[PDB]
Design a protein around this ligand. Structure first.
Ligand SMILES: *Cc1[nH]c(Cc2[nH]cc(CCC(=O)O)c2CC(=O)O)c(CCC(=O)O)c1CC(=O)O
Length: 299
């Protein structure tokens, strides 16, 4: 019917991604009418995705736009991820007003982040730092830093660039120092699998290479039954024709961090991620994840 409705959250970053996807759709289909259907979410697991899926199941919208790391590992029947857009810088960022790097932070400094993934890696290297929870939209996060509530905070490089706040990035951390969350930097689109018309329209937005990388990352997480908030790092790169997948699972306090890696052909992306996950599980990840999930442990 030439009309496409986009379901999205109401934060500045969520609306940015909605426009980004709209612009792409318009560029490849100049006669389409695009409508934004703003929602709200519990996050405002899968607290920040559920209302959007409901919108899709009862035909209130046609597609839902998410940041790949927020997309849940399991989907209600009839729904699924069908498009993965070009990946932006996938690195974590060091944001601070008073210090230029993590090394310069004196013992006792307060670093803010609610991510167990960012936390376990920070505690492993610097046991002297105090890691405190931090929640809210990027804008309120930056406010609490500015109000002297935190000495430094950790945020994704992609979020800040997208919002035109690149100047806040004191330092982009290498993946070797802070392994990214699965799909960090990529936008993914979910819709009703049987909606051939919508899916046909989406094809031009899919970025092959990014889809390959993210597939390896997600298969790893799906096996670990991971979710947006667990001490899990999962990051893949396309190096000389092969995918190089790295993963880690760590105790929040940094005492124990289990690491592993895989290298192989693009078409083996899913099996690779599942294999790496099982290697971590049989190496202690299971015990750590069971303490995090508390009882519920991966198969
Ligand atoms: C799963 C998870 N979500 C968030 C919050 C979040 N979601 C999207 C972004 C923007 C960057 C992107 O699109 O990838 C953000 C905020 C950000 O990371 O800058 C987090 C971070 C929680 C926190 O640090 O308090 C997570 C968990 C994780 O990254 O491990």
């Amino acid at each position: 019917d030439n009309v496409l409705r986009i379901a999205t959250r109401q934060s500045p970053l969520a609306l940015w991604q909605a426009h980004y996807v709209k612009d792409k759709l318009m560029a490849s289909h100049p006669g389409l009418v695009v409508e934004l259907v703003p929602m709200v979410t519990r996050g405002d697991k899968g607290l920040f995705v559920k209302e959007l899926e409901v919108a899709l199941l009862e035909n209130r919208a046609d597609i839902a736009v998410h940041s790949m790391k927020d997309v849940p590992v399991e989907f209600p029947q009839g729904l699924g991820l069908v498009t993965i857009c070009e990946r932006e810088d996938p690195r974590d960022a060091f944001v601070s007003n008073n210090y230029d790097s993590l090394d310069a932070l004196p013992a006792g400094s307060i670093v803010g982040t609610s991510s167990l993934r960012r936390q376990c890696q920070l505690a492993e290297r610097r046991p002297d730092l105090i890691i405190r929870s931090l929640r809210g939209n990027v804008g309120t996060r930056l406010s609490k830093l500015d109000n002297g509530e935190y000495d430094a905070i950790i945020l994704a490089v992609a979020g800040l660039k997208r919002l035109g706040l690149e100047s806040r990035i004191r330092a982009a951390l290498p993946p070797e120092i802070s392994l990214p969350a699965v799909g960090q930097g990529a936008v993914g689109i979910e819709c009703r699998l049987d909606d051939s018309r919508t899916r046909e329209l989406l094809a031009a937005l899919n970025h092959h290479e990014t889809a390959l990388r993210v597939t390896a990352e997600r298969a790893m997480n799906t096996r670990l039954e991971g979710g947006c908030q667990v001490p899990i790092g999962s990051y893949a790169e396309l190096i000389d024709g092969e995918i190089w997948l790295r993963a880690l699972v760590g105790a929040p306090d940094g005492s124990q961090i289990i690491r592993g890696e895989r290298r192989g052909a693009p078409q083996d992306a899913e099996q690779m991620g599942i294999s790496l996950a099982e290697e971590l599980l049989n190496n202690g990840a299971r015990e750590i994840l069971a303490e995090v999930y508390n009882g519920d442990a991966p198969a």
